Design a protein around this ligand. Structure first.
Ligand SMILES: Nc1ncnc2c1ncn2[C@@H]1O[C@H](COP(=O)(O)OP(=O)(O)OP(=O)(O)O)[C@@H](O)[C@H]1O
Ligand SMILES: [Mg+2]
Lengths: 174, 52, 464, 74, 509, 463, 147, 52
């Protein structure tokens, strides 16, 4: 839905930045602006009805500081024109998705009951390399409320070793 | 009538097992909670990596 | 590189994306890669996004699945071997008797026939059924409205029509089952087979067990079949003139309403597709004759709710040329066929068409049959011998007329023995005229029953 | 919010990213966007007039119906 | 005792054999058994879905970014955040002759309190009708125990015939009684109930049990307290069970209840999917929806049977006869749904409120109720003897107006009127009292022989019953032979007429 | 973790929550400012919920904090409510002090399972001529009262109330559903002067409150009836309880009101597509059980006397009798004023009522309907020109109509409030004799405003 | 409309007495209201009419043709009723209205044959004549109320 | 007969309850079979779950 609306903008931005290799700069700007729109105060100041697109654009330039670009300004302008400012963070997220798939990197999220040691983390990185990906981005998470084990999510892909096995045995008994 | 009797017998015979299993799993939960082995954590993650 | 991948699926409508440098045109054909289902471009959604319909079931399918195109609308086999063969809308055999022999393929769609090709004449098809041959003559390249319930020999009449057109005029026969129920379809097949006529007809059914698109496009399928056969020229040019049988065009309009609704477009006055007339016409204009060859149409018509002012029959009559109606009582009176010779209407009923004398003769017959019909009630209630003896003469003569209009059928030969009789005009005309003269008022009604021409009638009468 | 404008096209967006103005020769030539049933939404013709005939690279003609903030329906 | 302990332990050690890499989704949105979920990029169309609470769901809308799916069990237990999971499978339910004497859920789950069901076979609910080339004509009749029905409206094995009428017209009774008559047919039967009061359901159950016929019979009911999707899919499941035996070369009968009601449920479901509505809010595919169901039942070519069995069976041909029911508003036929239905069946039967209000039990109007399959669905003797009723009832219904009249009219009209009145009354009948074809045969013979054209109308039913008992006792072997064969022979009719004239000579009515 | 007022439009309310903390459906939400309460209708993601206001729609401020209970709506139940009138929330609205009990139960249980249907159909008698002869009841049945505005329908219900109360310890209960509060107060006071409230419980929805309240009064009454039936007394089987629906149509309309604002699309009449779902939910929790039973009486209103649209159509698929009141029979001076020719029950069956009673009903139907169709010609010419046949028929029909005149047990002032409650068997005897003609020699007046043959003969002799 | 008309009713003397805080004790409060609904072709199935009828205490109806039949006012007693009944009438008027209503019902009964007073019963003719007279009795001018 | 047999069978489920309590404490070790026996001894120590 909102992601659906955000789609084309992500495509355009990714195509252009890749064609200019400034993808990192745009990603940083996207994080900045996402945090910005997250602010209630900043938004409420922005949504004040007495402000033409120019006001909001220059405000974004200011809060960005010396990081913007003419392409950045044009992008901001176009989004302000249709007032699509709201769904910016989703655009950023999809943009991250595009860079990851483009560089063939896969980002992997792992939750463990107990904190982990870099030895095991590297072992798992190697293991998922054997799962035949190019490169991996590991984000760990301590979840002691989980009984034990590490749960790994790659998008729709999930593998479990924690309490879920037990849930399975109970449903099996019944 | 006789078939009804048989079905009731079977219903009780199966029903008891459910509370039995519930008690068993509650005990298993208690035992795992008292289990504080991060050594097992390491062993099992290594085991999975081997399975990986 | 034409491989596009599924992007969104609801019900039967299907959405795919492609590259913004290579985008298929509307009505192009998409074959799903790895499966035998086919997709049909409906409207370009921009961004390489296309919304299409599927042709059959839609199960198990999942997004991102690759699909190729054909860069062209749907093409099906056409050729001489197509007779005695039952294919789907895609022209794919379902008789399960091997693939189609021909390698000739033609796209389903083409523009309307040129104004230049509309033949500068208008003449009449000869048939040997002795009823339409006087009251409702068919034009050459006309549309015949047909009405009445089942069980009155609709199939039988179609049998005889096919037999005659293929026999005398060497016509070829194509039949399209729109919204068909399988059982009657199979029965019709077995009838095609027993009566040795299957070898001369091309058969395609769309069942009411299929998504609408199938049912919509079987029409154009059979149409193109007929077009190919007609435009297929004969020796010295002059390709055949062919007849087309289509069931329940009202079902066609309903399926059009179906697909329009599925596209999410607003209804029409009653609720049909607002574009109704468009498809109706697109069907129609490719039904005509040409300077080379001709095509004529028989179309089963059902009037839901008996509304002569409903949009669908109204649009139908915009193209109807002759109307034929079938009776229940007449058949119950053991008269076959049960064509009511009082409601059938022909645009061709004009002295400028059938000629002067023929026109007047037909009008006189109509007058007699009317006159006797209003006589009937008085005959019932107030007796018979309380009237003008001239009126009684009218009664006898009309009874002879009704006894006479039925005839044996060459298709009836295999049915119940009694080989049928082919009869042209200029004898029917003469015999009826003589009957109107009352020169045959010395003969019982029996000589007119189940018999051919007036010569046969007199032969029987003398022998009776 | 509401549906997308049938004028926000990654090509067009990237073009305005390159530069906003001087679009399509001051809008002397238009490019088709949306297609259904003899009805065409087109982007990029402001020089065009309401009720004007519209020429096509297909050699055909189009009828001007809706002059809008971002696109034209014909 | 310790038995189960070993059993549970040995079962357990069979699990956690590996870790799954499944793809699943999570909840985003919930309303009235309808859930929008995120994730699960790969997904079969119409995949059945599992959820953390043990429930299940049916996926319909595969939009480009999410999934809409309908709750199959009972929602009001799900919250956004909980994770879905596809089964890698399509909707499937069990079948098997063990289902006889069993009452299950639309998912095929016992409700009779008879414990688990040992169905060796399950099958996908959604399939396609066989090739039209695998259709062979219908000739074997199907009996209803209803003289009018079995005479003017023959019903052949594998035919689609529609009962229709207004409300509280015994339509349910018509179906169930038709079911009862299958003591000797050897076929099996399935009843599909939709949106019903469990009280009514249980009453039907108890009555059938009294008849004991719930032994070659299976029934499933989507009562009014059930998820709409369950109701929507149920008839398809019933069709699946029927097709089981049909493809086993067997012949059977199934009955729907209130296809209108399940259409309503489907309307509601589609509506909640934000689909484009049609006339009367009905998505267009309702025509497709019903039609893809009805055609699945027919009589098949035995060649199809043989090839499917791969040689297992070679002689018989499978068949399945479809008896649906539609309820109407004030006897309209122009309503969209009935209009759709009409062109689908092979024949239709109407029920007229006034007749039952006039105490005409049953209240069928033969004047419009037809069966375009002809006599091919009657036995030779009934095929012979139907015409008299046909024509007499005709003449009567054109000229029945003279009831109070004919105090001065011609005598032939009076005699024909008496004939018509008597034969009309003849069909009045009670539920749960099926007539064997021999009974119908003796009644029709007495009719056409005019041996009831001399007795008062008020006791015609009594006359008939007495005759019935008289033959049943005296001449049991004759009717035995008759219903063994159902053939018309001069010896047979002579014996029948001798018995009739004896009865008239013997004890009075 | 408290939600706040984020958007309000008429009857639909929305609240933000912390995404971890999300209320489940059908649980109460506590306005932190006022006593007003909110019920969950659907979860809008992101910690956003949609709700309906139980109580006043005033005092509302965007951004006002609101808390939950994380539990469905539960109200007190038990014998500590009899003769008391409660709100939709179970609070004393009669100013008779607070309720005495704490036995509080939720209101959204599931319908009783299939296996627990009462394995046998039952019957209920009322001692009333037209009903017990032509409108039989099954204990656990469903009864509809259509029309009737020149007579006291509430009088009829109260008569049935005294019937059941004296007939059984099985108590009674009524729910106000779009109540014409004039009639409600009248009924309240008249039951009061009857001194019969110990077997009665009162909840009112009186056309003055947000649609949810008038929706949910039905559930309240349902819950009370359920629990009260479930009180197995000294035997293991509680009493069979009786329910009174103020109007089923208003129950339909309550949901009909805000359905569209809920985002629901309209239905075939513009209605709510969840019509049948809620209807069945309501009805399937009203049955007879293996232990005990619950039946109800539904005061039915018909829009423009038209039945051929869904709103009565759905209802009819759940009733068991259609008692249709008659106005001009009241004009004929008849006390019950109930039509004898249109009202039916599915319970008219020889197997359940025996053969003799069934066939007597058949015969009386025939004679009355034949007498009706002769009215015109009788008016045109007169009795004399008719054959001697059907003259006795006219007399018998008139005497039947007189026999139906039943003095009310509880009006307190209509003829002295005399109860009849004549046995079904005695009435069978009397109508059998009348059909035979045992007394087709007496003026119909002797059959008027009386009960059995004993009263008719005594009246005929006294005059 | 509901919450509107709901406000209109009669209250207990106790209620107002405490409302006035005892300022008044004897009297009781009451309020009657009359809404007007306009019909299209006299249709009753119209949405708003349907609602308001379902709400009100009863119907009072007037037919066009009766006003055109000189019937001023043109009340149609065949359909207009009050659930209240004679309870809001004094002794004498309730005592009298009975036979009047009966005669109106009789006359309405024989409407279809009103155009054939040549072959009916004499007593029926008398009933019709009585109905005619009472019908004319129901005429009245405007601004002219009666004690 | 149903009431008698069901009540007595019920009465026979309590000794069976204690039996299967022991046997489920025994089955509680099959969590060790859940793993690769990364733990195979954590349960024999524990008997604190002596419930019913
Ligand atoms: N021939 C008959 N003789 C006696 N009673 C009969 C006869 N036929 C039907 N009935 C009775 O009529 C009653 C009503 O019929 P039934 O309930 O089947 O109508 P229905 O249309 O199924 O009702 P619904 O519309 O609510 O489903 C049945 O209870 C049955 O007992
Ligand atoms: Mg039914």
């Amino acid at each position: 839905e909102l992601l659906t609306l955000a789609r084309p903008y992500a495509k355009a931005a990714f195509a252009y930045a890749s064609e200019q290799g400034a993808t990192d700069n745009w990603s940083n700007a996207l994080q900045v602006l996402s945090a910005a729109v997250q602010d209630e105060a900043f938004s409420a100041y922005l949504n004040r009805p007495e402000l033409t697109p120019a006001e909001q654009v220059k405000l974004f330039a200011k809060v960005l500081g010396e990081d913007q670009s003419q392409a950045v300004s044009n992008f901001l302008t176009l989004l302000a024109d249709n007032d699509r400012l709201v769904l910016l963070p989703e655009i950023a997220a999809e943009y991250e998705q595009l860079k990851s798939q483009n560089n063939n990197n896969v980002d992997v999220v792992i939750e463990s009951a107990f904190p982990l040691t870099a030895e095991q983390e590297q072992l798992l990185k190697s293991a998922l390399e054997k799962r035949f990906n190019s490169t991996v981005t590991v984000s760990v998470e301590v979840k002691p409320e989980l009984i034990a084990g590490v749960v790994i999510r790659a998008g729709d892909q999930v593998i479990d070793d924690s309490a879920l096995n037990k849930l399975e045995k109970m449903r099996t008994r019944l | 009538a006789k078939e009804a009797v048989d079905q009731e017998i079977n219903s009780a015979r199966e029903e008891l097992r459910q509370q039995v299993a519930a008690l068993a799993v509650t005990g298993a939960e208690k035992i795992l909670n008292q289990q504080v082995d991060a050594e097992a954590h390491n062993a099992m993650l290594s085991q999975l990596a081997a399975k990986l | 590189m034409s491989s596009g991948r599924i992007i969104q699926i609801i019900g039967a409508v299907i959405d795919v994306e492609f590259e913004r440098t290579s985008v298929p045109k509307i009505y192009d054909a998409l074959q799903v890669d790895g499966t035998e289902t086919t997709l049909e471009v409906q409207q370009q959604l921009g961004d390489g996004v296309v919304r299409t319909i599927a042709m059959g079931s839609t199960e198990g399918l999942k997004r991102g699945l690759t699909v190729t195109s054909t860069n062209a609308p749907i093409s099906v086999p056409v050729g001489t071997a197509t007779l005695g063969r039952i294919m789907d809308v895609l022209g794919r055999p379902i008789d399960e008797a091997g693939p189609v022999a021909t390698e000739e393929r033609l796209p389903i769609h083409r523009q309307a026939p040129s104004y230049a090709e509309q033949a500068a004449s208008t003449d009449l098809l000869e048939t040997g059924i002795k009823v339409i041959d006087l009251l409702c003559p068919f034009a050459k390249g006309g549309k015949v409205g047909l009405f009445g319930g089942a069980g009155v020999g609709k199939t039988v009449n179609m049998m005889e029509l096919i037999n005659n057109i293929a026999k005398a005029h060497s016509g070829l026969s194509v039949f399209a089952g729109v919204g068909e129920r399988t059982r009657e379809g199979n029965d019709f097949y077995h009838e095609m087979k027993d009566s040795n006529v299957l070898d001369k007809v091309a058969m395609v059914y769309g069942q009411m067990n299929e998504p609408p698109g199938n049912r919509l496009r079987v029409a154009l399928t059979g149409l193109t079949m007929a077009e190919y056969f007609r435009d297929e020229k004969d020796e010295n040019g002059k390709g055949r003139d062919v007849l087309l049988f289509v069931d329940n065009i009202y079902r066609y309009t309903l399926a059009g309403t179906e697909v329009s609704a599925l596209l999410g477009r607003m209804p029409s006055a009653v609720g049909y597709q607002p574009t109704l007339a468009e498809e109706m016409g697109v069907l129609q204009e490719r039904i005509t004759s040409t300077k080379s060859g001709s095509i004529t149409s028989i179309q089963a018509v059902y009037v839901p709710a008996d509304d002569l002012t409903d949009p669908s029959p109204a649009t139908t009559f915009a193209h109807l040329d002759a109307t034929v109606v079938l009776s229940r009582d007449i058949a119950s009176s053991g008269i076959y066929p049960a064509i009511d010779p009082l409601d059938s209407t022909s645009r061709q009923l004009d002295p400028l068409v059938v000629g002067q004398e023929h026109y007047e003769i037909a009008r006189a017959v109509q007058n007699v049959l009317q006159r006797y019909k209003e006589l009937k009630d008085i005959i019932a209630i107030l007796g018979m011998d309380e009237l003008a003896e001239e009126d009684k003469l009218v009664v006898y003569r009309a009874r002879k007329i009704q006894r006479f209009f039925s005839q044996p059928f060459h298709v009836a030969e295999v049915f119940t023995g009694a080989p049928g009789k082919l009869v042209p005009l200029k004898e029917t005309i003469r015999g009826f005229k003589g009957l109107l003269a009352g020169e045959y008022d010395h003969i019982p009604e029996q000589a007119f029953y189940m018999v051919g021409g007036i010569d046969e009638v007199i032969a029987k009468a003398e022998k009776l | 919010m509401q549906q997308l404008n049938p004028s926000e096209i990654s090509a067009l967006i990237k073009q305005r990213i390159g530069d906003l103005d001087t679009s399509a020769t001051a809008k002397n030539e238009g490019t088709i966007v949306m297609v259904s049933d003899g009805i065409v939404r087109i982007h990029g013709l402001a020089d065009a007039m309401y009720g004007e005939m519209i020429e096509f690279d297909g050699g055909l003609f189009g009828m001007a119906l809706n002059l809008e903030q971002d696109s034209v329906g014909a | 005792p310790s038995e189960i302990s070993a059993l549970i332990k040995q079962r357990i050690g069979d699990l956690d054999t590996s870790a799954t890499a499944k793809n699943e989704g999570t909840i985003v949105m919930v309303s009235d058994g309808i859930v929008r979920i995120h994730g699960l990029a790969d997904a079969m169309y119409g995949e059945m879905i599992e959820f953390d609470g043990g429930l299940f769901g049916m996926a319909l809308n595969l939009e480009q970014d999410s999934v809409g799916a309908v709750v199959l069990g009972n929602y009001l237990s799900l919250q956004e955040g909980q994770k879905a999971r596809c089964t890698g499978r399509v909707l499937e339910v069990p079948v098997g002759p063990e289902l006889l004497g069993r009452v299950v859920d639309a998912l095929g789950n016992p409700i009779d309190g008879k414990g688990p069901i040992d169905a060796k076979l399950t099958d996908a609910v959604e399939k396609v009708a066989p090739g039209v080339i695998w259709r062979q004509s219908v000739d074997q009749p199907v009996q209803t125990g209803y003289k009018s029905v079995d005479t003017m409206i023959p019903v052949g094995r594998g035919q689609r015939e529609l009962i229709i009428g207004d409300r509280q017209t015994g339509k349910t009774a018509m179906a169930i009684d038709a079911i009862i008559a299958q003591k000797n047919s050897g076929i099996k039967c399935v009843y599909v109930a939709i949106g019903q009061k469990q009280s009514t359901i249980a009453n039907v159950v108890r009555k059938l049990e009294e008849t004991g016929a719930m032994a070659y019979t299976t029934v499933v009911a989507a009562a009014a307290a059930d998820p709409a999707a369950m109701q929507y899919l149920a008839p398809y499941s019933g069709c699946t069970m029927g097709e089981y035996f049909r493809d086993r070369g067997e012949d059977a009968l199934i009955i729907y209840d209130d296809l209108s009601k399940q259409a309503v449920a489907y309307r509601q479901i589609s509506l909640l999917l934000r689909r484009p509505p049609g006339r009367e809010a009905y998505p267009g595919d309702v025509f497709y929806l019903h039609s893809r169901l009805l055609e699945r039942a027919s009589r098949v070519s035995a060649e199809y049977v043989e090839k499917f069995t791969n040689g297992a069976v070679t002689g018989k041909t499978g068949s399945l006869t479809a008896l649906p029911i539609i309820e109407t508003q004030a006897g309209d036929v122009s309503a969209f749904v009935p209009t759709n239905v009409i062109s689908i069946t092979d024949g239709q039967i109407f029920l007229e409120t006034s007749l039952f209000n006039a105490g005409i039990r049953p209240a069928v109007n033969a004047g419009i109720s037809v069966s375009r399959v002809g006599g091919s669905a009657q036995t030779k003797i009934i095929k012979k003897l139907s015409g008299g009723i046909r024509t007499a009832l005709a003449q009567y219904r054109e000229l029945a107006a003279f009831a109070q009249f004919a105090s001065d009219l011609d005598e032939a009209t009076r005699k024909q009127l008496e004939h018509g009145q008597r034969v009309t009354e003849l069909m009045k009948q009670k539920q749960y009292a099926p007539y064997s074809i021999a009974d119908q045969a003796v009644s029709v013979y007495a009719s056409n022989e005019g041996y009831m054209a001399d007795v008062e109308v008020k006791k015609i039913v009594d006359f008939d019953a007495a005759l019935i008992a008289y033959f049943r006792s005296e001449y049991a072997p004759l009717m035995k032979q008759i219903d063994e064969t159902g053939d018309y022979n001069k010896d047979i009719e002579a014996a029948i007429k001798a018995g009739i004239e004896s009865f008239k000579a013997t004890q009075t009515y």
